[PDB]
Amino acid sequence: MLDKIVIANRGEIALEILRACKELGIKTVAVHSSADRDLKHVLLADETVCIGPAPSVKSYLNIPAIISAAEITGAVAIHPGYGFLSENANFAEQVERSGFIFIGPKAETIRLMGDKVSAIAAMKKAGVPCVPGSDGPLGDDMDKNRAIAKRIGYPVIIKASGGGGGRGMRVVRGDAELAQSISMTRAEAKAAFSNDMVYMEKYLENPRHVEIQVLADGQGNAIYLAERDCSMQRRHQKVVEEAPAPGITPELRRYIGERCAKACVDIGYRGAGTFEFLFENGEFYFIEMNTRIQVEHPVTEMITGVDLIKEQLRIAAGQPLSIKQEEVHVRGHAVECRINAEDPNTFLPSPGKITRFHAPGGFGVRWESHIYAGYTVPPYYDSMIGKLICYGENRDVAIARMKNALQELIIDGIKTNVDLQIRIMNDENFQHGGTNIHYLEKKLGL
Amino acid sequence: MLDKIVIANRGEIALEILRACKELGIKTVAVHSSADRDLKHVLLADETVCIGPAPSVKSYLNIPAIISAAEITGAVAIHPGYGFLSENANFAEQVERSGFIFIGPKAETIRLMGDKVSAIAAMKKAGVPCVPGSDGPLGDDMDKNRAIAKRIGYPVIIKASGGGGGRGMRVVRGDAELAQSISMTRAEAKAAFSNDMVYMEKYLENPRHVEIQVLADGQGNAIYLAERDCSMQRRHQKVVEEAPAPGITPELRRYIGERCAKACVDIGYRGAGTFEFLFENGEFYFIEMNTRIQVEHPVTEMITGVDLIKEQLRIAAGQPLSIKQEEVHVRGHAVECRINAEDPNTFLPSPGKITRFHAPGGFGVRWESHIYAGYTVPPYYDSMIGKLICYGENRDVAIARMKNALQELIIDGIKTNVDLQIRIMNDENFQHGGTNIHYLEKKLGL
Numbered sequence A, B: 001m002l003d004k005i006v007i008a009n010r011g012e013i014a015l016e017i018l019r020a021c022k023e024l025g026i027k028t029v030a031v032h033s034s035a036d037r038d039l040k041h042v043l044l045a046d047e048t049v050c051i052g053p054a055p056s057v058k059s060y061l062n063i064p065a066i067i068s069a070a071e072i073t074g075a076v077a078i079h080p081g082y083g084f085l086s087e088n089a090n091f092a093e094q095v096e097r098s099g100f101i102f103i104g105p106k107a108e109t110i111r112l113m114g115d116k117v118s119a120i121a122a123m124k125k126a127g128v129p130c131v132p133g134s135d136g137p138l139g140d141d142m143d144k145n146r147a148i149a150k151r152i153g154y155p156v157i158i159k160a161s162g163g164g165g166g167r168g169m170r171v172v173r174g175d176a177e178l179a180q181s182i183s184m185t186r187a188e189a190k191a192a193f194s195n196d197m198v199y200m201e202k203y204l205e206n207p208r209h210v211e212i213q214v215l216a217d218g219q220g221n222a223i224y225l226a227e228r229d230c231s232m233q234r235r236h237q238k239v240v241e242e243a244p245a246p247g248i249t250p251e252l253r254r255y256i257g258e259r260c261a262k263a264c265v266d267i268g269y270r271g272a273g274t275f276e277f278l279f280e281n282g283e284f285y286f287i288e289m290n291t292r293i294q295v296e297h298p299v300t301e302m303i304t305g306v307d308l309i310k311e312q313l314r315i316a317a318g319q320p321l322s323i324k325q326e327e328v329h330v331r332g333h334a335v336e337c338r339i340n341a342e343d344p345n346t347f348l349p350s351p352g353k354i355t356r357f358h359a360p361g362g363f364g365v366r367w368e369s370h371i372y373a374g375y376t377v378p379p380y381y382d383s384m385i386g387k388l389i390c391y392g393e394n395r396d397v398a399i400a401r402m403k404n405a406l407q408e409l410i411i412d413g414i415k416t417n418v419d420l421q422i423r424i425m426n427d428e429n430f431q432h433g434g435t436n437i438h439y440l441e442k443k444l445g446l
């Protein structure tokens, strides 16, 4: 066990990490921007270090300051959570070169899987099925560019190799739009990711977003913890996540799961990670790996009994995996609704003061949030303000519970997506299950 | 199913009733004092009626106003929750005489079991074991009074027949103290309950407080849902409740459980109710029946899978019991900690403004409360401000979870018993389990 860790994050994930540390008897160090001084996770941590002013670049992305916090507190490890620096290889290597355990994969693995182009190359080599595409970056030869398109079949999607969070993606319907679409994706990617490498991928018109949770100890053992369906999306971002994926058979789970576990071993993967697939006409197609814990980790926890953050900590401590593959069982069903305060016109976090707040309760209802009545939501970070996760003995029970939980939830003073979430739960097509990644945008007329 | 009900209560129980109504598709009517206008349960109810000013006598105990609220909204039933008028037979008969279903026992049953003297008489007649005692009210014949004492054995306790909430009770160690102890209990009882009938009971020096949950449909069917141990007490009031009772065997459960189920039938009991026993040297001794839902109902729900409030509503609707005795199973363990804001000098609710509030989360952790950051706690009602209930696969897991949950809980600005609760969870004697009703007072030096 690690004696003391720095939690290099904020919000729900910092709260979840702190909870896991407490159960394992790990001393905690909270870093915060000056704006997050009074957040729940800061109050509850054993020690706190202010790591800079409000802007993320100055604080939560401030690598030297985070390392300093670790050194002055004498921590032995740093948990990056998700977002921020969690998939920053430079951060990972600095942490480890400064004599700290990085609670995540090796830096080289973050680089390998962090470049989406190279991630696909490694996956193909490993025997993991991928989306037909350019299999390498796109040049300026518009003849080979249109030929790749013909070989894979329109529509196609232009994707930023350094891309993330849904940004740096453009669909192309025909030859006529290809050249300019490639051009403004590169421009979009330069501006957002400081990397204008793009590739081409077949645009799948009827897939579900089905992702595989893995854990690997980096000592040769790797397991899959069933799957999640995250097909309810807007602007390529997830709104609702569930586990298990509706209608996925033990056969399909095992098929793709064992290929992911083998890929982990081939790449020397360490820690928690997720292989994201598009699933269409009975076939899985790898799109990317998230080399980190994910927002929606609790739905997997609910259906498997496996606390993924606890397992991150045991792995980081050097323990081999405490769970064998055949010990992983799927029981019941879980649904997560992300609660966001996003400006609907700009897609940016919506600042404001919460004037009235009440969290839902009851059996099978889990709420995770740093917000409280009188909280001022800052514009500096992301738009998620809470996570609502309901368990049921089956999917119908889980959805019904979620709907009731959402109607118990009170958040006044700021704009939220609570009303949208209730409408999704009441959606007949969602209730039947297996709706594809394109459904919500069409429903909403986007 | 009932179309619409009035929730004649406030706080946690009103929230729990509203939740149950929602799941069953029952329209809800919240009554409130003028002081409770913005409480969570008022906000969430379909309709709201202000039933009077802040003082309970003027509002929550205001029988005509509560009935009026039912008539103007066209409700078909009234749920009294616990406390207040829930064991007021006058209220029960007025509700039913005005053409509404009272969600509870028949008025005559409330009277029968509401007079503790007559409750004991009926229990003995029914074959339920009771504490040796005077078996009738105490007169002024101090010779027969000391003779009863000799027959049962000192120490003895003088108990108000109309008593409740821990008040109107006095221990007597010898003949020398008997006459005056009887005198000031009667006086205490006149002042508090407007009834100075007292009886004598053997004062049990090593019992656990073990109570049996029942449900009865009033159509001849009655089941017991295991037991709760509520031995952690101060001034005769419960601080911690758990289920099942540690070390109670299937044999002991069945023994006392079947006697309670038979008593229900003999008295024509209807709805949820609890038989409270003292358990000493392997023997159960009835002390009283609570003819209503209890605060600690969720620990039973957690270990049995039975939602007791849902079952109250189905029974009130005229449905026979939806559960057979052999279908009742005990799985895992649950512990509840009452969170109180009580003045430690006067034993009265402590008013104040909550300056910072954060509820605990995580697996197996349930929080029930109407409080929020910026809430002003009124002095008008009771001192409980929330209920924290943790589940575990066994008792050690449940206690460990509770301890962690209590340390995650933040309530600033007002005095609470959170620190006491943490200390109880850390108490080696509690951790071994089976501590008696006298333990906490001795621990605290009271």
Ligand SMILES: Nc1ncnc2c1ncn2[C@@H]1O[C@H](COP(=O)(O)OP(=O)(O)O)[C@@H](O)[C@H]1O
Residues within 6 Å of the ligand: A131, A157, A163, A164, A165, A166, A167, A201, A202, A203, A204, A205, A209, A233, A236, A237, A276, A278, A287, A288, A437
């Ligand atoms: N080839 C594709 N066809 C159709 N939709 C896609 C494709 N690639 C990505 N998407 C959509 O964009 C989402 C995010 O894609 P991903 O590659 O994981 O980007 P990011 O790195 O921004 O998360 C997917 O869940 C899917 O809905």
Ligand SMILES: Nc1ncnc2c1ncn2[C@@H]1O[C@H](COP(=O)(O)OP(=O)(O)O)[C@@H](O)[C@H]1O
Residues within 6 Å of the ligand: B131, B157, B163, B164, B165, B166, B167, B201, B202, B203, B204, B205, B209, B233, B236, B237, B276, B278, B287, B288, B437
């Ligand atoms: N005969 C007794 N011997 C010892 N303790 C008792 C006895 N009767 C009551 N008590 C204590 O007082 C508590 C409440 O008693 P009860 O009769 O249920 O009164 P109330 O109606 O106020 O709840 C019991 O849980 C027990 O701890």
Ligand SMILES: [Cl-]
Residues within 6 Å of the ligand: A080, A081, A082, A086, A103, A104, A291, A292, A293, A294
């Ligand atoms: Cl992570």
Ligand SMILES: [Cl-]
Residues within 6 Å of the ligand: A429, A430, A432, A433, A434, A435
């Ligand atoms: Cl569908």
Ligand SMILES: [Cl-]
Residues within 6 Å of the ligand: B080, B081, B082, B086, B103, B104, B291, B292, B293, B294
């Ligand atoms: Cl009740």
Ligand SMILES: [Cl-]
Residues within 6 Å of the ligand: B429, B430, B432, B433, B434, B435
């Ligand atoms: Cl003990």
Ligand SMILES: [Cs+]
Residues within 6 Å of the ligand: A113, A114, A115, A116, A288, A289, A290, A291
């Ligand atoms: Cs990636």
Ligand SMILES: [Cs+]
Residues within 6 Å of the ligand: B113, B114, B115, B116, B288, B289, B290, B291
């Ligand atoms: Cs009683």
Ligand SMILES: [Mg+2]
Residues within 6 Å of the ligand: A276, A288
């Ligand atoms: Mg992705």
Ligand SMILES: [Mg+2]
Residues within 6 Å of the ligand: B276, B288
């Ligand atoms: Mg009692």
Ligand code: NA
Residues within 6 Å of the ligand: A349, A350, A377, A378, A379, A380, A381, A382, A383, A384
């Ligand atoms: Na924000």
Ligand code: NA
Residues within 6 Å of the ligand: A406, A407, A408, A409, A410, B044
């Ligand atoms: Na609401």
Ligand code: NA
Residues within 6 Å of the ligand: B349, B350, B377, B378, B379, B380, B381, B382, B383, B384
């Ligand atoms: Na109060």
Ligand code: NA
Residues within 6 Å of the ligand: A044, B406, B407, B408, B409, B410
């Ligand atoms: Na605390």
